[PDB]
Design a protein around this ligand. Structure first.
Ligand SMILES: Nc1nc2c(ncn2[C@@H]2O[C@H](COP(=O)(O)OP(=O)(O)OP(=O)(O)OC[C@H]3O[C@@H](n4cnc5c(=O)[nH]c(N)nc54)[C@H](O)[C@@H]3O)[C@@H](O)[C@H]2O)c(=O)[nH]1
Ligand SMILES: Nc1nc2[nH]cnc2c(=O)[nH]1
Ligand SMILES: Nc1nc2[nH]cnc2c(=O)[nH]1
Length: 613
């Protein structure tokens, strides 16, 4: 709503910037500390800035909201040598088009959006066990043997009891049929019996394509026509399969593992054959309900039958499958050991299918130039546990990311805070901007700042948090990590996180950019320094910082002593950019004087924590 980035460019690139209609800061590397804070403090939109920034650290530069743009991969600093955030392609200078240039900045900038979410996420796999409002991404980096991934993802087209279908959505071309099958089924199974594995280009491309989850799986692959395989996680079977005795002989019962059953089998004048192949695929699985958690059985749709039977949990259109291709896969969940609790997905049973309702089903969702999102929601739906955060009570520690402030959750604020009162790490939208690509609403910053900050719960804006995690967990969040601080500040981040001893006023906490431009706007629109300094932060709802800690840094920490207090920075490897109980309590009084009801206990709670400490 207010937060900007400084789009710092390098020298060769500078001259053009001068053309476009956004403001240009200019340096001049001297410039004492307190210049950059008052200058930067001017610009209300994003800016461009060029010139010598030798002397500064990075955290110092990110705290200002710098984004680094050059023809070069990097740029000298005082802290370290920072990988350029946005690299302009040569020709796409050069040529000085101002628009091509700017247009260029934005893309990468949205490409940057992931970096942020990532560091965060990455912290939480270092911390939490439950995850709520998850998706394919959080899935993608989950250790399924430890993490516990929940949410309510948007559900794919299914046949069962039961139809409702479709309805149709836009989609995109994806990995070929068979591979793209593997793609959504293989998430947590430790062992995989693949019946009918053919020439194997299938399975092999899966490896050459997504190697990790290939390699943490054991693969029995049954087929007469199957080749040899050097890969030692691939016990290859050249027997053909009519029974479960062909599969049983090859399992270790002394050890509990999640096993997966994939049946994809067809022979070489009509084809009941085709049929009693699939049925068997299934039957063999069904007998072995007891060992497998799952079955991705092939299921071609008959010509000669108007409605038929089968044992199934779900039925669905396979992504990247040819339009004419009239074959859905059947998914059967089963009783048998699993790291993902699938009980919600009903215990695979007998199912009457109206061929034509299935016919239509292929007709909406199949097509070579489709499948991308289908695949997601298939994958998403199969391996996330359908549970709802605001409502769910956890015995273990949890993470609550980028789902809380979604438009579905509207008006149920109370719960949201209760979450943030005890989530390892959760996040809320706060940005008051237009603001494309993102569908959330935002919380009054003030309200966040006050409900949010607890003894255990640290309450920063996204950037603030990034800075903090850099400073506290330097190798969950490398200093070099590319992210966009502007955007990072449309987020409110909470962390189960002790206030520092000593409460050193590190950038991660103490940034407050443009608080002066912020203040005077106040006075001319709704009128009425450390005392007032506080009132603004709240009145502005430009800022989301950790009240508690900030408090505790003032009275317990500053002053104290110029001498004795830097020193306790050194040391705490902290750093800064700006270089009494009776004051603050008035701030509060005045603030809620201007806002009964529309807040905020609490306040009351906060006041009565000074008038006690
Ligand atoms: N190695 C090997 N594999 C075989 C063989 N036959 C089928 N497959 C396996 O069938 C899968 C899908 O085939 P495709 O999608 O081309 O067609 P289907 O197998 O249904 O065709 P099929 O029923 O065997 O042939 C008759 C024709 O019916 C046509 N058809 C038209 N409308 C429909 C419909 O509504 N439903 C079905 N099932 N078929 C329809 C199909 O296009 C098809 O060409 C292939 O991936 C392969 O694994 C074979 O002889 N050798
Ligand atoms: N910043 C950000 N990163 C993400 N990574 C995946 N989803 C998101 C998101 O909504 N925001
Ligand atoms: N099946 C599947 N779908 C995805 N959608 C985005 N990433 C993935 C992935 O790794 N697997």
């Amino acid at each position: 709503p207010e937060p900007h980035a400084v789009l710092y460019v390098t020298n060769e690139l500078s001259h053009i910037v001068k053309d476009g209609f956004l403001p240009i800061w200019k340096l001049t590397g001297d410039e004492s500390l307190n210049d950059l804070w008052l200058e930067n403090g001017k610009y209300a939109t994003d800016v461009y800035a060029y010139g010598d920034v030798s002397k500064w650290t990075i955290r110092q530069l990110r705290g200002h909201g710098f984004i680094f743009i050059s023809t070069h991969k990097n740029v000298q600093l005082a802290d370290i040598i920072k990988t350029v955030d946005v690299r302009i392609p040569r020709e796409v200078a050069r040529s000085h088009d101002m628009k091509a240039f700017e247009n260029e900045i934005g893309r990468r900038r949205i490409r940057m959006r992931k970096g942020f979410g990532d560091a965060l996420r990455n912290y939480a796999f270092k911390m939490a066990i439950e995850f709520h409002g998850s998706e394919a991404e959080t899935l993608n980096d989950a250790n399924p043997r430890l993490h516990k991934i929940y949410g309510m993802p948007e559900i794919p087209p299914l046949y069962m009891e039961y139809a409702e279908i479709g309805t149709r959505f836009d989609d995109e071309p994806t990995d070929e049929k068979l591979v793209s099958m593997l793609d959504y089924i293989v998430y947590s199974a430790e062992e995989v019996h693949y019946i009918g594995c053919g020439d194997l280009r299938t399975l092999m491309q899966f490896k050459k394509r997504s190697p990790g989850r290939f390699r943490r799986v054991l693969w029995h692959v049954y087929d007469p026509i199957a080749p040899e395989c050097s890969d030692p996680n691939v016990i290859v079977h050249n027997i053909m399969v009519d029974s479960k005795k062909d599969i049983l002989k090859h399992m270790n019962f002394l050890k509990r593992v999640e096993r997966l059953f994939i049946w994809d089998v067809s022979s070489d004048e009509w084809e009941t054959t085709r049929f009693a192949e699939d049925r068997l695929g299934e039957e063999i699985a069904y007998e072995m309900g007891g060992a497998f958690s799952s079955a991705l059985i092939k299921h071609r749709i008959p010509n000669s039958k108007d409605e038929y039977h089968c044992i199934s949990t779900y039925l669905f259109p396979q992504p990247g499958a040819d339009a004419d291709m009239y074959e859905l896969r059947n998914f059967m969940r089963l009783r048998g050991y699993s790291h993902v609790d699938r009980h919600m997905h009903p215990d695979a049973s007998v199912t009457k299918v109206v061929s034509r309702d299935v016919r239509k089903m292929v007709e909406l969702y199949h097509g070579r130039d489709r499948g991308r999102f289908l695949k997601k929601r298939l994958f998403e739906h199969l391996h996330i546990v359908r549970k709802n955060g605001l409502l769910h009570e956890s015995d273990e520690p949890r993470a609550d990311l980028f789902y809380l402030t979604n438009r579905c959750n509207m008006g149920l604020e109370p719960s949201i805070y209760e979450v943030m009162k005890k989530s390892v790490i959760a996040t809320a939208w706060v940005g008051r901007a237009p603001l494309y690509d993102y569908d959330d609403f935002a919380l009054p910053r003030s309200t966040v700042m006050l409900n949010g900050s607890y003894r255990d719960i640290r309450i920063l804006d996204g950037n603030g948090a990034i800075l903090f995690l850099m400073w506290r967990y330097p190798d969950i969040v490398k200093k070099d990590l590319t992210y966009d601080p502007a955007w990072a500040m449309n987020f409110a981040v909470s962390l189960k996180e002790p206030i520092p001893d000593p409460p050193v006023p590190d950038i991660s906490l103490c940034r407050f950019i443009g608080l002066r431009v912020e203040s005077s706007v106040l006075r001319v629109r709704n009128p009425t320094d450390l005392s007032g300094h506080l009132y603004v932060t709240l009145m502005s709802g430009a800022y989301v910082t950790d009240l508690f800690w900030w408090f505790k840094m003032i009275l317990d920490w500053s002053a104290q002593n110029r001498e004795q207090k830097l020193r306790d920075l050194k040391r705490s490897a902290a750093e800064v950019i700006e270089w009494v109980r009776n004051d603050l309590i008035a701030a509060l009084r005045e603030y809620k004087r201007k806002m009964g009801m529309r807040e905020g206990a609490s306040i009351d709670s906060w006041l009565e924590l000074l008038r006690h400490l």
